[PDB]
């Protein structure tokens, strides 16, 4: 049988979602955001044209 049927059988929805992954790492995500805002750091790499050597 096609994949969505087994997806619905295992969980209940015939779709792929990242909500479970985000919920699993929620305490870590919150603590990491707090630490990053405390340390004064910006997300991403806004100096993309950079090479160590």
């Amino acid at each position: 049988r096609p994949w969505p049927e087994a997806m619905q059988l295992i969980t209940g929805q015939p779709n792929m979602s990242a909500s479970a992954m985000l919920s699993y790492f929620k305490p870590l995500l919150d603590w990491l955001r707090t630490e990053n805002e405390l340390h004064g750091e910006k997300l991403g790499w806004p100096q993309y044209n950079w090479t160590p050597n």
């Binding site: 991403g44 790499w45 806004p46 100096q47 993309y48 044209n49 950079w50």
Partner: protein, 522 residues
């Protein structure tokens, strides 16, 4: 009824555009905004009326075409607040690009069109070129980046309401080609080897001049060591890449100085060539009603534009002012072609008064310009060149003409490729510049002279990016104009060395151009 009302509405809108582009103030901005609101109102009303019609069941072609073209509202499909915000964003981007001047804080300041372009095309010092390039990119891009995401979102919303898909389909639908991208990619792959050879030769010449610290044999050339602020048409100044300097090589620098060669008489010469081709002349009011010279005050015009049509059948002005040069002559020929194309289909209805293909305008304007740039026609008019007497002269002219019209193909492809990618959401706001420079490296052979970090909106330095006009029409026109010239030279009765074939009193070629150019968008 639509034609009857649209004629006057668009005539008044074009008058407002003239007044804004010549008498730049804040009252001109207010008048332009409110007249944009008025034309949006008219277009919305008549498009809503035409939406009740059905195009599929209409058993005709011309009326079907008119209804189909009027079906979409373009920008006027947005809500009132969204339309007002979009107009304000577009005006703000245009006015922050036109007025931007970058300078050393010592006190002396320079403008793009008068001085920065001149100081970039003339100077040969690495540091001065780097200063000009970096400063202009800095100021223009950092000014425009604040607005650009909002403009992208609003234009995407307008296109989605019009029934297209994320504003890429909207601009690709002007060509009526479901397979446009594949055809253009095939054409670019065909032109790739010649461009690669020219790039290698130019890199060798630049390494000979600037040394090895800046330019190495293996690798890209810096994007500012070429001649233009954007390197769109690089090394048009070919004094550094001339194959072998020969005595009969044309100078084309003093040949328009000891004879005066005012812009008025250059446009007169272009019009005379157009008439001798066998085409109807421009109305006499054009010269004394338009403007093509420097002003008598500080505020003259926007940085760069093209010819303007008023759709009322009498006003065919030209706005370009660039003093006197050979590039000025070719640009004047291009604008004369634009005007003659605008004037050929005066008989057609207003909805069809656009042109057969957005690239056809530039292609037909520039094919005669390509024809007149040959040394034979220059010999026939005020100059003395060896023509086809020496093969070395022919190869030098070919190289000079190929530094134009080639190395512009990759840029004209690249700009609209990047804009299509950003419009369709593939380029996220966080990496506007990284993908632009990746395209610059991939298609062209250019590298950023200075590390260009995120937060520098390099694509905003091009005028067409904030002004929001398509750019791939130039690539299409540069592809097509050579086909047009080949056909017109075939109609001349001889082909031989096509690189030096010249069109002059070819009545049959002019007639063939007219019978297929009078069709317009029909």
């Amino acid at each position: 009824e639509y034609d009857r009302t649209s004629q006057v509405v668009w005539n008044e809108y074009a008058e407002a555009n003239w007044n804004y582009n010549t008498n730049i103030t804040t009252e001109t901005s207010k008048i332009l905004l409110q007249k944009n609101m008025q034309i949006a109102n008219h277009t919305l009303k008549y498009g809503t009326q035409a939406r009740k019609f059905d195009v599929n069941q209409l058993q005709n072609t011309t009326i079907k075409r008119i209804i189909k073209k009027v079906q979409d509202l373009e920008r006027a499909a947005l809500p009132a607040q969204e339309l007002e915000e979009y107009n304000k964003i577009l005006l703000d981007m245009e006015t922050t690009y036109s007025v931007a001047t970058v300078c050393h804080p010592n006190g002396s300041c320079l403008q793009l069109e008068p001085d920065l372009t001149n100081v970039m095309a003339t100077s040969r010092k690495y540091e001065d070129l780097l200063w000009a390039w970096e400063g202009w990119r800095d100021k223009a891009g950092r000014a425009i980046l604040q607005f650009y995401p909002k403009y992208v979102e609003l234009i995407n919303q307008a296109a989605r309401l019009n029934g297209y898909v994320d504003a890429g389909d909207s601009w690709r639908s002007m060509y009526e080609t479901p397979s446009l991208e594949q055809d253009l990619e095939r054409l670019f792959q065909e032109l790739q080897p010649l461009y690669l050879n020219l790039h290698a030769y130019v890199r060798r010449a630049l390494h000979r001049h600037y040394g090895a610290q800046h330019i190495n044999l293996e690798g890209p050339i810096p994007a500012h060591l070429l001649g233009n602020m954007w390197a769109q048409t690089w090394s048009n100044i070919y004094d550094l890449v001339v194959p072998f300097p020969s005595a009969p090589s044309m100078d084309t620098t003093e040949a328009m100085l000891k004879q005066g060669w005012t812009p008025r008489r250059m446009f007169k010469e272009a019009d005379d060539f157009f008439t001798s081709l066998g085409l109807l002349p421009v109305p006499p009011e054009f010269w004394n009603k338009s403007m093509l010279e420097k002003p008598t005050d500080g505020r003259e015009v926007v940085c760069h534009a093209s010819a303007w049509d008023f759709y009322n059948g009498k006003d065919f002005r030209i706005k370009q002012c660039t003093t006197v040069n050979l590039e000025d002559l070719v640009v004047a020929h291009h604008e004369m072609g634009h005007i003659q194309y605008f004037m050929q289909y005066k008989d057609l209805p207003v909805a069809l008064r656009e042109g057969a293909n957005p690239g056809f305008h530039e292609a037909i304007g520039d094919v005669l310009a390509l024809s007149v740039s040959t040394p034979k026609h220059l010999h026939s008019l005020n100059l003395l060149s060896s023509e086809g007497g020496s093969d070395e002269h022919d190869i030098n002219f070919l190289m000079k003409m190929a530094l134009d019209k080639i190395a512009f193909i990759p840029f004209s492809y690249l700009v609209d490729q990047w804009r299509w990618r950003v419009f369709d959401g593939s380029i996220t706001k966080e990496n506007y510049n990284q993908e632009w420079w990746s395209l610059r490296l991939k298609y062209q052979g250019l590298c950023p002279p200075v590390p260009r970090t995120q937060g520098d909106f390099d694509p905003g330095a091009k005028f067409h990016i904030p002004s929001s006009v398509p750019y791939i029409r130039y690539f299409v026109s540069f592809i097509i104009q050579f086909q047009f010239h080949e056909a017109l030279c075939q109609a001349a009765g001889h082909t031989g060395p096509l690189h030096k074939c010249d069109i002059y009193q070819s009545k049959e070629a002019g007639q063939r151009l007219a019978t297929a150019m009078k069709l317009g968008f029909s």
